[model samples]
Target: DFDYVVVGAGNAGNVVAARLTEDPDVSVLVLEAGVSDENVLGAEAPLLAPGLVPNSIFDWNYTTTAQAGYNGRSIAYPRGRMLGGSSSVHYMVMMRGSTEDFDRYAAVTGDEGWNWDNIQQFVRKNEMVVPPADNHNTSGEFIPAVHGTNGSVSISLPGFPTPLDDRVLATTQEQSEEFFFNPDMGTGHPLGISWSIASVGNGQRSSSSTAYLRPAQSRPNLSVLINAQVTKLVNSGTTNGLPAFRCVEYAEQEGAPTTTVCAKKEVVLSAGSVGTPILLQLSGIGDENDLSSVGIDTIVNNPSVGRNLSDHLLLPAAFFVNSNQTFDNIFRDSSEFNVDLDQWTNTRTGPLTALIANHLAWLRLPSNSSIFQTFPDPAAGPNSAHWETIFSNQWFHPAIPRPDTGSFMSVTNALISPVARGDIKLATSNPFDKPLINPQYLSTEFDIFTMIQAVKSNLRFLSGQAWADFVIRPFDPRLRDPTDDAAIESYIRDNANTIFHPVGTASMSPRGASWGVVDPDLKVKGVDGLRIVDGSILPFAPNAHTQGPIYLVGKQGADLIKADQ
Candidate 1:
């Protein structure tokens, strides 16, 4: 029996296991359903990021139920299945939400530890900031104080950026005159255009597996078992009259005999937002109705297990550019592309050193904007953003079909503070079956309005003087009728999809709240010897990407567990 049995060696799980094993005597066992991510070029190379998704090698390859919001379409939602989790395959845009984000979490959970000041320490703890190297300048950007000097994960600016990125930054600045370019968006208030710091070091992806857990693998007390799918939680009827989980059952293959391993101290579920809740529900820890319908007996009647799901829906608008240096040409120009590849293979330099989008901008709509005027009171807060716009140098949304000829830049507008919440439920009682994920995109009218505002914002930025010389109008105008609200709404309903930020399936809240699966300490409510440390426990979606915040969760969670021990 190990001191701790961490489930799923993904983004949070790797950190949790690595941190717990810091004490050489404390044994930790990590079980991953997928295989290792060692020596995978697509997982390591930055530009080849497009090829990693929608593939089973390191992806869960999950598809959502037909979303009523997207004209009844089922969109592909790929979660990283291998080591380092989504951080291994995700678009390495490193960003953090506003300071108010954590304060709101503290307010929701009634825990001071979740506050911004306290959580920021963990944020720094998990990251090692690396500024641009010699002659690879980002204008001396970044707030050094906000970053960590010595940490597991490496965070750095892109050494090789496409020239067009400068134009996008200028246009973004001109479009939003009130908000200047923020040198460091990670400093709590992320609301301006800046060259995004990525999860890359030495021209390779710095995934949790490579940076955090891999280093700790030498410790004899730490062990990682891959290709081992956990089927269910093995429960010991009761310990001191409280529901207790001592071991978890697993199987190497379908229809194979299951194996069980006991956790001497605790069992931490870091299987991600989608996988974590489904695991809990399958282990007889969710709503009774859900469990009984699926032919499983309920051990814990927590109805909030799979509710409060939130994800950023990306509505992309492609605009053709006059430049010939965009990513679109890479598919057609074999010789040129091969040269870049050869350069990257030899020296880890050239265009291949960066992802399609090296720079990103975050903008909050004006208070008097139509979105805020229509929905005055937002649950997130009055100062909270209605939407966020990110500009990329090429067609970033892979799900949307694209042409190989013309130069293009895709601007994706996402809803930051969505009132619409969805749920995750079991498709069947079988552990092998994928969970039924229904993000219920655009379910709330406010979300639609926010989309409309986002479309308008994109148009305003593209029409500005900074881009006037390079702009050639929207690539597809079937939905570009700005004055027509119905046309815009139809466009959104037709084209909107996930930006790959999914969270809040197993949310944390105050002890007495009925809508929470975990308490302020991140311990599973109504259960002992169990805790959840993943995106599932986020009280609400942060203003920025979920990965950075999730890393903070792992660091803070490890501390919390250690303190109790």
Candidate 2:
């Protein structure tokens, strides 16, 4: 029996297992339902992010049955099944959000450590920043002192600027004068338009698996099993209502017979938002009513296990621009694009493989109190300003016959802190069947209003001098102004989707003792030997993408577990 059994070889599990195995006496077991990280080049190159999306073999392509809020649209969610989890296949932007974000979670959740002052050190633990590129040096980026000097994940600014990024940043700054440009905001004070800092260092992708697990594989204490799907959490006989995890049952894949892996010390669930909650409910640890409906015997009834699920809602606003001047307008010729593709696949460097979003500006809507708005800014209110546009992959060739002959840009908005909560449920008893994931995005006008505000923000940015004078001349499509409420509403309905950063299915509450799943220490309440150390444990989603901050959660969770000794 091992000392610790970590479920899901994602960011959290990898970090925790690596940390635990540092002590020679402790044995750690990590079971993954995907392939090994080293075996995949798509997993290593930061430029190959889009290629990793449709490769379903290493992706859990989960979709909602139909969203009630979106006029019955089913959204697709692509999660990484490889060793590093989503981090291995994502546009790597490392941000921890503003001070207001962390402090807000502390105020609502009442956990001191959840506050900015307290969590800043933990944020520093996973970081290491490389110097800025020459061209971007003029922008004067924001660098935080709270960041770590020596960390596993390598955070670096690009060596040069991509033409599309140059225009996006220039136009945004010209349009939004108040927007500051920060070089490094991974230290958690992100509120500007700046060159992105990625978790890439030494010219390689520093995934959690590579940063934490790769070095520890030689240790006899840690055993990582890939392509193993965890079936259920076996309950250790408990005399009281609370039950401890005894063993985790698993198999090679969906159709194979199940086997059990025993654990002596604890069972840590790091299977992400959907995976953790589903495993708990299937183990008879969820809402008594939901469990009974699924025909599972309940060992413990926790209604909130699958409830409170929330994610970012992304909406796209298309614009046709000059292909000659910027990367934004590509796809004019197949031969040139193919040559670029061949260069990328052969050398893993160049323009073809870059991040999805380059310049990020986290703006707060001056509160209009719509009671039904998603974004809360008065300046960003529908038709109030420019649309908050995010960069996305240029999929269709511009010359190909389609609705518009221009490139597309998506403005992805999350509640940054969503108040609306949904649930994750079992579609069937079988582990193979994808779980029902309903973020219930835009269930309220509050969310809708926020998105409208973001669109207005984007429009404002486009109207700025930097764009108008330098980049906004060609490929102009006759589109409605983003601030117009009607246009904003229509665009949201047609193009918004999950940014793939889902969180809060399991929350951390230190004092309430109510159905809160994990304590501040990240241990699941009531279950002595069980814990949750992942994005799911976040009571609130961090202000930025889920990957980098979640890596810190894993690092901190490991420190907490080691301190328990």
Q: Pick the candidate with the highest TM-score.
A: 1
Clashes (backbone N, CA, C under 3 Å), per candidate, total: 0, 34
lDDT by residue for model 1 (298-396), tens: 989999999999888888778888886777766567998899889878887777777656666666666666555556645366445667777677766
Give lDDT: candidate 2, residue 463.
Answer: 61
Runs with alpha carbons beyond 4 Å of true place in candidate 1? 131-135, 176-179, 370-376
Candidate 1 at residue 169, lDDT? 67
lDDT for model 1, please.
Answer: 0.82
Report the C-alpha lDDT of model 2 over 1-565, residue by residue, as the tens digit: 8988999998778888988888999999999988877857667656556567643787887877687777788866788888988878877777776566667667766666667787767666677776532324533554546566777777766633554576666655565555655566654555556666677764457788888888898998899898888989988766246677768899987778888887777788999998899999888888888888878888877788987776766665455444443344334666766775676567644555455556666666554445435444422123122223355434321112334345444334444645567889886777787899888887876677667777666666666655554333312232355435775586566666766778888887765578677788887766767889998987665667788668767877887888877
Error of 1 at 522 (Å): 0.8
Question: What is residue 25's positional error in candidate 2, in angstroms?
Answer: 1.4
RMSD per model, one decimal: 1.7, 4.2
lDDT of each: 0.82, 0.69
